[PDB]
Amino acid sequence: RKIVAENLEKVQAEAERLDQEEAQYQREYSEFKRQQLELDDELKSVENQMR
């Protein structure tokens, strides 16, 4: 029983690590998507001006 409990504790630690990594990745994705949408808008605008 003690061994099982210790294994659960380590699993929880790794879960916390994964959660922190997820948070960082989500911030990065937010920034990227912001840039992507802005770029698409500017692309369409420049194309219209060219035509």
Next chain:
Amino acid sequence: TAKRELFLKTNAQLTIRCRQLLSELSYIYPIDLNEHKDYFVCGVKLPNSE
């Protein structure tokens, strides 16, 4: 970025043509001047409003 540079290139030629054909409109309508400082369009006067 490439497409924006190309668009600027095209606009340059557009304005060039605009001035080119605006320069030929003086072959039809001349604006002239004489020493007394009167002004003539096609040789007929047009003083200031007053």
